Amino acid sequence: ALFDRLGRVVRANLNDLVSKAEDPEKVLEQAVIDMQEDLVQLRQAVARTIAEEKRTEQRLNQDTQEAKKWEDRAKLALTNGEENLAREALARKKSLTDTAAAYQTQLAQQRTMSENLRRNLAALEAKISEAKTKKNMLQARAKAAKANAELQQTLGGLGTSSATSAFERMENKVLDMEATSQAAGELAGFGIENQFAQLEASSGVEDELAALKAS
Amino acid sequence: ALFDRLGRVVRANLNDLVSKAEDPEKVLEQAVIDMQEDLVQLRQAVARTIAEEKRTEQRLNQDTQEAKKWEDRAKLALTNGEENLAREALARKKSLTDTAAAYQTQLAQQRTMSENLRRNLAALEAKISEAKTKKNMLQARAKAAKANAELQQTLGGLGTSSATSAFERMENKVLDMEATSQAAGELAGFGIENQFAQLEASSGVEDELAALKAS
Amino acid sequence: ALFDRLGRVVRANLNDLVSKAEDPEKVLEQAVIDMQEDLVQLRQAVARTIAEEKRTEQRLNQDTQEAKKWEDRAKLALTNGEENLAREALARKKSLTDTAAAYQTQLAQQRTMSENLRRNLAALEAKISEAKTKKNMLQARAKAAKANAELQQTLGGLGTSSATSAFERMENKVLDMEATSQAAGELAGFGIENQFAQLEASSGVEDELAALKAS
Amino acid sequence: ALFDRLGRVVRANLNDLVSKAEDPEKVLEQAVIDMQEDLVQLRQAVARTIAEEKRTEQRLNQDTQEAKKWEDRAKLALTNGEENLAREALARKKSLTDTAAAYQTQLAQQRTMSENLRRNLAALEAKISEAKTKKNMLQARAKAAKANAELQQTLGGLGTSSATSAFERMENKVLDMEATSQAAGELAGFGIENQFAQLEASSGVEDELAALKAS
Amino acid sequence: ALFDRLGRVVRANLNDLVSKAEDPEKVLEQAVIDMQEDLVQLRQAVARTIAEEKRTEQRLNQDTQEAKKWEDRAKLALTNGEENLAREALARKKSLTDTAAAYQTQLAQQRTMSENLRRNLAALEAKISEAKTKKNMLQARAKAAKANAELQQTLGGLGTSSATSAFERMENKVLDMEATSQAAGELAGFGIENQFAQLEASSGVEDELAALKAS
Amino acid sequence: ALFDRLGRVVRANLNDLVSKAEDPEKVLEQAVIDMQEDLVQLRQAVARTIAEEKRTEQRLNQDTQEAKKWEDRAKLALTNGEENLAREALARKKSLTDTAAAYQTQLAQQRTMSENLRRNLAALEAKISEAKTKKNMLQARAKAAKANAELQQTLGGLGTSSATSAFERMENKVLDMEATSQAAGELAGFGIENQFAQLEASSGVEDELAALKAS
């Protein structure tokens, strides 16, 4: 349906605006806080399982302690003489003794669930801890991305160095053109040729001075 | 008949709505209260049986005590002299004595019913008590079911951790792509090749410094 | 019937709200006040049984005292001379004497009920007194539960100590990173290598000073 | 019923507010005033029993004094001569004499009730008096509880002494750090080593002065 | 029917407007979210199949454990002496043992369905994962399409470079036309011909200077 | 009948309006969607045929498994001793065995229908797939028809180029007519003939200059 495609495109445009606003390193801190809240909720469920194991433990010890009570009352009645009453007390002692087995098995059963949820806690603890160390390395990688952007700004500064160097190269071309214009006027008037003829006569006089030193 | 099948389907749909609304642990408390009301009604029936046994007991003792009365009146009349009157009193004593046997047998008969209903009370007491202990273990099992649902929420939190980790992985891919773009521009301009030639000349100078330390 | 299951579920939801509002230690005081009202009602029933025993006692003494009256009137009539009147007075004395036995047996019968209800009072007194001592220990156990919740708050304070220690660890990492950046710039400029060469020359001068002390 | 549990919880919350407002020593004075009002009401009941004993006493003496009147009238009529009238007066004297016995027994009967209520008064007097002495010791114990709270305030003053001593210890650490900084600069400039060489030369001069005294 | 052709043409025009609004890369993210919702619904159906396998497993173990109960009761009755009761208990043990086979076969039957749906889950997992990797390559291809559009903009910039170069070529044609107009006026006045005659006389003077250097 | 010819002409006029509104490429997408709905309906009929084949398969296996049951019961009765009962069980085993053949033949019969409808599905799958590829080529052909209409617009642009070129040709004819009017006035005044006589005298002077260079 075309309305479902338009709703998916609007949700994708909203997600693209969310990614454009995403903040470096702050998202990792928010993930660590969210993992801490999840660990507190998991610890509450583990605590409720441990409380069930403690309830069954208390009931077990209650059963044992009450069976000893019936056992003592049976001996009291036996010493008095009412033997049938002692047999009745022992009969109730048997009921308590047998119920001890059911609560014992239930207790060992709850130990398996306790260990299961404890293993889940341990693995999720590993997950949160690797989140911690991953953030440690990921903050170093995010700083390295900012340093790579600084290296790109140093390369981009080549455009500004080309503007300053091009302005200096234009001023140097104007100075060299003024010097060339003085040399072109001095050559075109014959003055450079007269100076070359005078330099040849000065070289002839230097050769005559070398011969005068040689003789 | 099709109307009986529609009535059974409507009652099954009503039962499915009742199961959807069922509350954890509260149903076990309502069962313990219903077992207490049933035990009070059973105790009232047992009390009526015990009252029948007490009525017959009183009638038995009445018969014995009245027979002693006739026995004494017979001796009074004997000492006076009216022997026939004493024989009449003894004749009534015989009637009372014989009725004692019928009420004695009826009393021992009612003892069997008393013991029957008492055994029923004892067994139903065992039933209610195992209901109590069963609720004790069943509340621990219901808490373990809530803790299993918490472990499923910790596994389901993997989808939210994949959304946070995927947002971090997209930001890391954008930073690594900016660094790769700076390295691709630096290589494509020949600057990475000029830096590799300068690093080879720096390694040659380090080998010359090692030879200068060696000589 | 589905309406009976909905009524039991609504009553269980009301009981769960009552347990959520339950107040520590105040419920034990309300139980002690309710046991005091029940003991006052039981004491009123015991007092009515003791009053029945006192009524029969008064009737017994009345019978004895009246029999003595008839005995004296018989002697008065005997001394006067109307012997038949004295025999009549003695005849009534016999009736009173015999009724004394019936009221005597009834009195000893009421003593058994008095002792029965008195034993019930004694046992329920034991029950209320163990309620008192149980509250004494139970207030100590409720304070120990509040202290266990304080120990859980001291362990939960580890999250706040991790926030303060993590802020200090981030400030220490920033200071150590600034020191490392100064050391990396000093090494990369060759200044750390020049300082290591000067430290080797200072160690050579210290060895020359040790040789100059040795000679 | 859930409304009875909510009423008991509201009454327990009201009792907890009453205990929070409880005032030391003033409650013992209010108990002494309440015991004085109860003793005044008990004394009024004892006074009504003593007034019943006084009424019977007056009736007894009235009977005796009236019997003497009839006895005198009998002698008057005897001396006159109407012997039958004297016998009639003596006949009434007998009626009064016999009624004296009934009121005598009733008086001795009321003495038993007087002594019973008097014993109750004595025991409740012991109760109020032990309340008095108990308050005497209990005011000493309440003052000892206030003195124990003062000893807890003296121990709690250790936190304020740690704040003052910690401020002094920080100022002493700043002064010792300034002295250490002067000693570290004096050692690092070689001045402490020059002073140690001068102290060795001063010890050599002291040994030369000891040899110059020895020779 | 012509109304069905008009409805198909209107739906095709609506689809063409939907394709014109289609957004690059956002549709792949919406497909990954839709595959995650479908995987959650498939996982719920697989979980219901696994719960059916667990129900049958519990019933199987229940049957075994109950058969052991009947086996023990048979030995109790045998040791007591009621042999027929023991044979009855063994008769019920046989019923439980045989039902174990039916639930065993049903359990192994449900394992086949569990594996079937698990294989479907695995294959659809492969489908979603190839969707993930396909999006990875498809985002690279979409960026390459944007870069191809940038290369088309660089070629289209040839029209703007032709406008700037054509304006410079018109200014250069105007300057060259002004120079040509000065040369055409200088030639048409005979001044270029007089300068060519003077350049021929200057070449004759240069040849005379070369002969004067040669002699 | 003339009313049937008028109804056919009205339906043909409605079809001509439908063809005038026909949209390029969108009709091929609507045909692909209509082929998908037809394939879903055909797949539902094929699924009902496969379910009939599965029903017969289950009945076949039921027959085999039940025949084994009767075979075992026959051996039980044989070992017990009731031989006639075993022969009866084998008699029922024969009935089940023979019914197996009828359901076997019916199953192989339904396989032929399954294969027939499966072949129809395969061929219609070929039809829909060639519809897909035909649309692939047909979208390329529809784009080529739009490009042919663009080539017709480029040829039709020759009319607009003739309007611009005709306006330029009229301006060029007006400029050439103004130049011709200046030349016609200059010729008609004799000035062109005087300039031709002066050009002949200038050619005579150029021939005299060539003779002066030749001598």
Numbering used by the authors:
A (entry chain E), B (entry chain E), C (entry chain E), D (entry chain E), E (entry chain E), F (entry chain E): 1 to 215
Extract from the study:
A prominent member of the PspA family is the vesicle-inducing protein in plastids 1 (Vipp1), also known as IM30 (inner membrane-associated protein of 30 kDa). Vesicle-inducing protein in plastids 1 (Vipp1) is critical for thylakoid membrane biogenesis and maintenance. Vipp1 appears to have two functions: in membrane maintenance (that is, during heat or light stress) and in thylakoid membrane (TM) biogenesis and/or remodeling. Vipp1 binds to negatively charged membranes and membrane binding depends on stored curvature elastic stress.
Using single-particle-based helical reconstruction, we resolved the structures of type I tubes at 5.1-Å resolution and two structures of type II tubes at 7.0-Å and 7.1-Å resolution. The type I and II tubes differ in their diameter and the arrangement of the monomers relative to the tube axis, as well as the diameter and thickness of the engulfed lipid bilayer tube. In contrast to the Vipp1 rings, the monomer orientation of the α1−α3 hairpin with respect to the tube axis is the same over the whole length of the tubes. Nevertheless, the monomer orientation among the tubes differs; in type I tubes, the α1−α3 hairpins are oriented parallel to the tube axis, while, in type II tubes, the hairpins are tilted approximately 45° relative to the tube axis. Remarkably, from rings over type II tubes to type I tubes, the α1−α3 hairpins accommodate a wide range of orientations along the tubulated membrane axis from perpendicular to parallel (from 90° to 0°) while essentially maintaining the same intermolecular contacts to stabilize the assembly. The here-determined structures of Vipp1 polymers in the presence of membranes indicated that helix α0 is immersed in the outer lipid leaflet of the bilayer. However, in contrast to SynPspA helix α0 that protrudes toward the bilayer, Vipp1 α0 lies flat in the membrane plane and appears to be partially submerged into the outer bilayer leaflet. The bilayer thickness in all three Vipp1 tubes remained nearly identical at 35 Å, although the inner leaflet radius changed with the tube diameter. Nevertheless, the same or similar intermolecular interactions of α0 with another α0 and α1 + α4, as observed previously in Vipp1 rings, are present in type I and II tubes.
